[PDB]
From a paper:
The crystal structure of mAng-3 contains a dimer in the asymmetric unit. The CSS for the dimer interface of mAng-3 is 0, suggesting that dimerization is merely a result of crystal packing. The two Zn2+ binding sites in the mAng-3 structure are completely different from each other. One of the zinc ions has only two interactions: one with the hydroxyl group of Tyr14 and the other with a water molecule. In the mAng-3 structure, the binding site architecture is very similar to that observed for phosphate and sulfate ions in other Ang structures and both anions ligate the same five P1 subsite residues: Gln12, His13, Lys40, His113 and Phe114. In mAng-3, His113 from chain A is observed in conformation B, whereas the same residue takes on both productive and nonproductive conformations in the other chain. The nonproductive conformation of His113 in chain A of mAng-3 forms a hydrogen bond with an oxygen atom of the nearby sulfate ion via its ND1 atom. In mAng-3, the side-chain of Lys40 points towards the active site of its own protomer. Arg31→Lys31 substitution in mAng-3 is subtle and preserves a surface charge distribution similar to that of hAng.
Angiogenin (Ang, a 14-kDa protein), an unusual member of the superfamily, is a potent inducer of blood vessel formation that was first isolated from the conditioned medium of cultured HT-29 human colon adenocarcinoma cells based solely on its angiogenic activity. The murine Ang family, over the course of evolution, has expanded to accommodate six members: mAng (the murine orthologue of hAng), mAng-2 (also known as mAngRP or mAng-related protein), mAng-3, mAng-4, mAng-5 and mAng-6 27–31. Experiments have shown that mAng, mAng-3 and mAng-4 have angiogenic activities comparable to that of hAng, whereas mAng-2 is not angiogenic 33–35.
Author numbering:
A (entry chain B): 1 to 121
B (entry chain A): 2 to 121
Write the structure that this text describes.
């Protein structure tokens, strides 16, 4: 019921209204979501409703690994990957658009972590 | 101007459904004022405005002469009127589905939902 980790998940991993989904999108979003001090190396935005993402914690997800959940359907996502090595802003990013399953961690029915290491079929 | 697009959302967009049963349809139809007279068939899409609009763009394909089919499945709830009276209160059966949807777009914006479309 403390919303802190859930809102943190949203800040870092949720954008219902993307524009472009190219490197410029990634570079502006990583800045707007304050993920640039230091440059976050890999960060994926999910483009769907809070309700549908939350449903991965319940009806619309399967157990994955010890504690994660995998979605039962694909989600629109944009993965921003840091380029150029240096961890100090300004931060340059490559942007990878995808429609794929996502793996998250849930706590008390809410998304609290995004598994950036998951490789979807 | 936004009129037909907003009208499309009023009748067919709900990012935050609960229940998705007869009660959901009966409250939503009333809330969206689709009850004077009772609308016979009406589908609510449970996804973002952006993703639905994308059916008019990259996440859709041409369908028929004037329509668009989504390239992926959407969570939907179809409300089908029952009881036989066009007057409030309007009663509904709910059908939850995860399916392709067909819409009409105008200039990149969704303006109608094809209730007659039968998805694989
Ligand atoms: Zn939305
Ligand atoms: Zn009827």
């Amino acid at each position: 019921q403390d919303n802190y980790r859930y809102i943190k998940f949203l800040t870092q991993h949720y954008d219902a209204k993307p524009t472009g989904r190219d490197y410029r999108y990634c570079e502006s979003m990583m800045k707007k979501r304050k993920l640039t001090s230091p440059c976050k190396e890999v960060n994926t935005f999910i483009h769907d409703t809070k309700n549908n993402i939350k449903a991965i914690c319940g009806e619309n997800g399967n157990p994955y690994g010890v504690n994660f959940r995998i979605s039962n359907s694909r989600f629109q996502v944009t993965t921003c990957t840091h380029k150029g090595g240096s961890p100090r802003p300004p931060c340059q990013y490559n942007a990878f658009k995808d429609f794929r399953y996502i793996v998250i961690a849930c706590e008390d029915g809410w998304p609290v972590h995004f598994d950036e290491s998951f490789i979807s079929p």
